[PDB]
Design a binder for this molecule. Structure first.
Ligand SMILES: *[C@@H]1O[C@H](CO[C@@H]2O[C@@H](C)[C@@H](O)[C@@H](O)[C@@H]2O)[C@@H](O[C@@H]2O[C@H](CO)[C@@H](O[C@@H]3O[C@H](CO)[C@@H](O)[C@H](O)[C@@H]3O)[C@H](O)[C@H]2NC(C)=O)[C@H](O)[C@H]1NC(C)=O
Lengths: 48, 48
């Protein structure tokens, strides 16, 4: 094996969907899934 | 929110952006109308 499928998963759409109140509550947790998005993007680049 | 260049400047937390492609936000189609579909019954409940 050389590479695997490049998957990008979004925070606000997965955890909260299209809910503004849920996003406002999610802002209290900080930048957890800025980190998560960054890690997934890094894996995606590493595959290429 | 002025333009994509400023949006990617804000995403990188910097005023100068290097050459490349950056993921900034998500495009989503906002709904236009509200639809309600309830059964055509009209007999009031015997709550009283
Ligand atoms: C408890 O009962 C009262 C009174 O109802 C009447 O008396 C009872 C002893 C029974 O014989 C009942 O069958 C009888 O109707 C209820 O008050 C009544 O509720 C109805 C339903 O909303 C009212 O009807 C409307 O009233 C106005 C015009 O007056 C318009 O909005 C409508 O055209 C429609 O007629 C009625 O006026 C009202 N009657 C009195 C005396 O106020 C009461 O609702 C009920 N309790 C509960 C929890 O429903």
């Amino acid at each position: 094996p050389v590479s695997m499928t490049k998957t990008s998963v979004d925070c606000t759409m997965y955890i909260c969907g299209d809910s503004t109140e849920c996003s406002n509550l999610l802002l209290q947790y900080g930048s957890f899934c800025t980190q998560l998005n960054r890690a997934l993007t890094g894996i995606a680049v590493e595959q290429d | 929110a002025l333009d994509p260049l400023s949006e990617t400047k804000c995403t990188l937390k910097s005023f100068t952006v290097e050459k490349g492609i950056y993921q900034t936000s998500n495009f989503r189609v906002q709904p236009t109308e509200s639809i309600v579909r309830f059964p055509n019954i009209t007999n009031l409940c015997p709550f009283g």
